[PDB]
Amino acid sequence: DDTSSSINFLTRVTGIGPSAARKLVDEGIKTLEDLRKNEDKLNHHQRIGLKYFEDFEKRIPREEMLQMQDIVLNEVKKLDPEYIATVCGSFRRGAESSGDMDVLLTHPNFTSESSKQPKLLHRVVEQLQKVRFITDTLSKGETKFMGVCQLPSENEYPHRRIDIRLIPKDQYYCGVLYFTGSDIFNKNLRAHALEKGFTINEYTIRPLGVTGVAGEPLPVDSEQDIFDYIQWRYREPKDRSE
Numbered sequence: 001d002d003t004s005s006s007i008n009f010l011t012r013v014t015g016i017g018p019s020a021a022r023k024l025v026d027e028g029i030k031t032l033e034d035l036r037k038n039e040d041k042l043n044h045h046q047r048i049g050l051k052y053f054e055d056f057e058k059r060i061p062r063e064e065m066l067q068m069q070d071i072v073l074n075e076v077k078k079l080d081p082e083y084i085a086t087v088c089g090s091f092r093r094g095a096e097s098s099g100d101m102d103v104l105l106t107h108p109n110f111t112s113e114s115s116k117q118p119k120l121l122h123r124v125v126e127q128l129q130k131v132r133f134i135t136d137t138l139s140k141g142e143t144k145f146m147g148v149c150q151l152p153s154e155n156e157y158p159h160r161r162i163d164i165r166l167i168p169k170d171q172y173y174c175g176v177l178y179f180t181g182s183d184i185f186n187k188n189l190r191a192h193a194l195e196k197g198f199t200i201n202e203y204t205i206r207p208l209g210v211t212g213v214a215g216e217p218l219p220v221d222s223e224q225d226i227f228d229y230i231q232w233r234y235r236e237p238k239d240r241s242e
Contacts, residue, residue, distance in 0.1 A: 006030040014049035014056055014161070015138060016042070045138040045146075052136075052148060055158035060098040065091050067151055068101055068133075068160070075127050076105070083107050083124070084172065088179035094238040100161035101149070104175050112168040112203075118142040121166040135159060143167075171203045173220045178202035184242040189232070196230045205229055 003025055010021035013035065029038055032053060039047050049056065069087045076085045086092070089102045105124060110117050118141075125145050128134040136148040136159075143166040151157040167175045178186060178201075193200045197208050204217035205226050220226055227234045 002030075010035075012057070013046060013053055015045035016049065020046070048136045048138050048148065052159045056161060058158045060100070060160055062091070062096050062098070064151060064157070064160075065098050065101065068149065068162075071131070071133050071151075072101075072103060072128065075131060075133070076124055079123055079127055080107070082109075083120075084169075085124075086176050088176060090182070092180045092237045093182070093240055100163070102179060103162070103164040104167050104172070104179060105164055106167050106169045106172045108169050110166065110168055111170050113170075114168065116142075117166070121145060121164065124164065134162065170217075170220070173223050173226065174200070174204050175202055177223050177226055180237050181240040182242065185240040188242060189226075189230070192232060193230045198229055200226065200230075 006025045006029075007018070007021045009031070010016050010024055010029070011018060016024070024041065027038075027041060029035060029041065032050075035042070035050050039050070042050065065087070069091075072087065073085055076083045084106050086104050087101055088104060089095075089098060089100070091098045091101070105121060107120050110120055121143060122140075122145075125134060125137075125140065125147075128149070132150075132152065134147050134149050138146040138148070140146070145164045147162055148159050149162040150159050177189075181189065190200050193205065194208070199206050199208050199215070205220060206215035206217050208214050218225075218229065224234050
């Protein structure tokens with residue numbers, strides 16, 4: 001009824017899932033003005049999501065992505081040129097517009113053997129805040145940051161969703177591959193790998209064999225290494241629609 005019409009609306013606020021939305025509509029919270037007069041009922045992530053409600057429903061043109069990409073790769077390099085940062089999503093594939101910016105970050109000092117270096121991520125988050133790029137934090141942990149960013153103006157741009165995730169160096173490219181391609185491409189590359197006797201996931205590529213269910217991750221130093229193993233000619237991100 002109107003109770004389902006309100007829940008649908010509430011699910012449009014980042015951070016407010018179905019469960020939270022229902023109890024909220026139960027509390028008598030139905031419209032955006034209701035939410036704005038009841039921040040005390042929402043968690044941080046939800047409140048920030050509400051603050052940028054409109055901006056968050058606005059698409060991000062490629063021109064802007066390219067500019068935000070320059071700010072991120074640039075600040076990252078200054079901190080330590082040994083950091084590798086890659087903006088993924090449909091954007092990497094050449095999309096004319098995006099809904100957000102998803103970044104995978106790594107550093108050779110951090111391998112899957114390592115695991116426990118929050119500061120490699122935080123140092124980046126902190127620097128991006130110092131330059132007034134990252135403006136708010138939805139939530140931040142030891143390997144993942146979900147937040148808000150905004151392009152600078154001499155007057156202004158809509159606030160945008162940005163996420164940055166710290167990935168082990170030895171699992172990096174398998175990571176970038178997963179976060180690019182496309183649901184359909186990943187599905188197609190994954191199946192071709194199987195025919196070749198390999199199994200690919202977002203962390204590694206392994207050899208399979210008889211009886212099935214086997215492994216031991218091979219070294220990956222580029223996306224190319226993954227394509228080589230399954231003897232597929234390298235496919236540029238723009239040819240990864242499927």
